[PDB]
Amino acid sequence: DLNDYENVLNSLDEEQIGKLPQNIKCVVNDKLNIDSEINIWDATSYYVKSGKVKAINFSENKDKCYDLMEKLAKAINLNKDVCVQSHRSENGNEIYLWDNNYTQDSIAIRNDSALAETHDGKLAVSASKFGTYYSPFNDKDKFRTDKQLMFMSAEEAEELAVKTAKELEINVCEKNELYVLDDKNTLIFPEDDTDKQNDTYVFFMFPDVYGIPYSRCPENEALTGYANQENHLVIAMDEKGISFLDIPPLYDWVETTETGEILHPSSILSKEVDKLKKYVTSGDIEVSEISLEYMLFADKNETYDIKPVWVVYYYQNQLVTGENSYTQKMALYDVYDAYTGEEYRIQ
């Protein structure tokens, strides 16, 4: 049976990474279920490099900054003639802004982030029910549907997102995630009485190197050494075109430090199930994703060590404080060194 736990483990022990399944489903026991995506992205084998990377500073070189600004302005169709530029320096970081005060379109570029948005895009992605953070509930998951909006197909929308990442010169995995922000995306914080829900597609693309995306884990400064964030390039579009473009921190590969064979995900899942069985008293669990990612660890002088990890994303149905039986589905995760299987402490 395709849904037996031992058969699922065996299916995750493929000698060729490209032959692993993309989804697995099985019951472990009456308090632990697996209904999970398997993500090995564009990895070509289990032999993976570790290395050193340098942070890409988007704003330190004014020429490079303005070059990024023009690509973002093309994407959101910003009227550059009527825009007002502003600039600030904060703790050695340069911040550049371009605002169209008539339309409320804006571009903001800092050392490790860039955001271009229309007024409608801003409200769809950041003033409504949709949220981009995995923690604490993975609210985005309810918008990951096959609905086709009426202004363009999901296939045509994906072609525009792929073309935009190429224009921005950001290498991303072939797999992206699509969120459909239709009427279910309730507008919570309108700015004016004229603001309404606007049908929008939101793609998450994943900047990568050697076919493996940088970590999609929540911030965990104890583990990474810095205020890390989820690696997703967010591209949204409505009937007017691209409406929101958020670029996460990017990195430039400097050198390979070591290369080795990583564990098959069977080894990770069996170890993670053994761990999760011990946390049974804290609530029922459902494993939702096993993913091969590159984690960054702060080193020195804007350099980071880049090493492969296996991330297990799961939900736990936890009792709400002060409640006798009311529970909340919490989005949690575990991280393993992909070479050794060392489990990292996630507090």
User: CB of 321: closest distance to Na ion in angstroms?
Assistant: 37
Cβ proximity to Na ion, 183 vs 192, nearer residue: 183
**Binding pattern for the stretch 166-205 against Na ion, x by CB under 5 A and - elsewhere:** -----------------x---------------x------
Provide the minimum distance between the beta carbon of 197 and Na ion in the complex, in angstroms, as a whole number: 5
| Least Å from the CB of residue 75 to Na ion | 23
Which CB, 180 or 205, lies closer to Na ion? 180
Q: How far is the CB of 262 from Na ion (least distance, A)?
A: 44
Instruction: Specify the residue, 142 or 264, whose C-beta has the smaller distance to Na ion.
Output: 142
Number of residues that bind Na ion (CB under 5 A): 2
Name the closest residue to Na ion (Cβ): 183
Nearer residue to Na ion within complex by CB, 80 or 196: 196
Nearer to Na ion by C-beta: 167 or 239? 239
- Per residue, the 3-state secondary structure of the chain, as one string, reads CCCCHHHHHHHCCCCCHHHCCCEEEEEEECCEEEEEEEECCCCCCCEEEEEEEEECCCCCCHHHHHHHHHHHHHHHCCCCCCCEEEEEEECCEEEEEEEECCCCEEEEECCCCEEEECHHHHHHHHCECCCCCCCCCCHHHHHCCCCCCCCCCHHHHHHHHHHHHHHCCCCECCCCEEEEECCCCCECCCCCCCCCCCCEEEEEECEEECCEEECCCCCCHHHHCCCCCCCCEEEEEECCEEEEEEECCCEEEEEEEEEEECCCHHHHHHHHHHHHHHHHHHCEEEEEEEEEEEEEEEEECCEEEEEEEEEEEEEEEEECCCCCCCEEEEEEEEEEECCCCCECCCC
Q: From residue 128 to residue 167, what is the string marking binding to Na ion with x (rule CB under 5 A)? A: ----------------------------------------
* Contacting positions for Na ion (CB under 5 A): 183, 199
